[PDB]
Design a protein around this ligand. Structure first.
Ligand code: AND
Length: 284
């Protein structure tokens, strides 16, 4: 209980999670063929993808993403609140999960449910998590940038190692009910990425309906919505509410790694990811 819940070799947050729900998640939760699920390692762009999916279902009309909080419109199945709400929700259901493949519901692998897996450059994921997690109460905090940098590459951080999460899920990449996307293609060509998603899910949008979704799904529009940027967390769970909105700390890895840290991280990545095709990863 040393500042985190330990379960099957993986660390989880202290507030909002319990050992028994995590066990029922694997052994008993029932997945349906009509469910749609967003899968990500934390801080890889979950909130932006969730906003786009709500907008496609509502044909571009936006008071929903402007009225309801992301954890209500796309709940995390492994948390208490999420598990409760989902277990009593009428199809179709839209939800999210950060779990690695060994802890995901057994029921899924016997289904036809559609999943979308989103990955991001791990240098930006490391920076974004450093600033976000060190600002949350009741969570084990690092004593310095250098110390967090070492935790991340050894794997002793929330939800485990980024290298193990990616290796576990990649073998599902050519299955019919699985779509692989990168944060980089989403930001460089949002419109082309929205079309890949509409084809995979198999729905049809009218011309004026696609125009509205395109208007409400821009990067800029995304960062300023209070329903999606986490700035609705109460003063009871945050250390300093004022820097929740700080800038230059949710990516921009070059402004934070020293030259020696970047050369050493390049060698580590090549070593660990050598058994997969290099061109699957669109970043230097
Ligand atoms: C919502 C969020 C933050 C965003 C993540 O994608 C999902 C998540 C899991 C546990 C939450 C955390 C916010 C901060 C919380 C509330 C803590 O301080 C402990 C539990 C933490």
């Amino acid at each position: 209980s040393d500042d985190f819940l330990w379960f099957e070799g993986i660390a989880f947050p202290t507030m909002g999670f319990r050992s028994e729900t995590l066990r029922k998640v694997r052994d008993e939760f029932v997945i349906r063929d009509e469910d749609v699920i967003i899968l990500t390692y934390p801080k890889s762009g979950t909130n932006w993808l969730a906003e786009i999916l709500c907008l496609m279902h509502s044909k571009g009309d936006a008071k929903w993403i402007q009225s309801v909080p992301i954890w209500e419109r796309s709940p995390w199945v492994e948390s208490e609140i999420g598990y409760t709400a989902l277990s009593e929700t009428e199809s179709p259901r839209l939800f999210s999960s950060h779990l690695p493949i060994q802890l995901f519901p057994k029921s899924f692998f016997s289904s036809k449910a559609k999943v979308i897996y989103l990955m991001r450059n791990p240098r930006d994921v490391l920076v974004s998590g450093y600033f976000f997690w060190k600002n949350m109460k009741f969570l084990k905090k690092p004593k310095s940038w250098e110390e967090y940098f070492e935790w991340f590459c050894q794997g002793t951080v929330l939800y485990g190692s980024w290298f193990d999460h990616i290796h576990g899920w990649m073998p599902m990449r050519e299955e019919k009910n699985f779509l692989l996307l990168s944060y980089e293609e989403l930001k460089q060509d949002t419109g082309r990425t929205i079309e890949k998603i509409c084809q995979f899910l198999g729905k049809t949008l009218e011309p004026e309906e696609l125009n509205l979704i395109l208007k409400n799904s821009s990067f800029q529009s995304m960062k300023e919505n209070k329903m999606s940027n986490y700035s609705l967390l109460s003063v009871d769970y945050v250390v300093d509410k004022t820097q929740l909105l700080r800038k230059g700390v949710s990516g921009d890895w070059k402004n934070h790694f020293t030259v020696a840290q970047a050369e050493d991280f390049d060698k580590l990545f090549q070593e660990k990811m050598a058994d997969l095709p290099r061109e699957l990863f669109p970043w230097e």
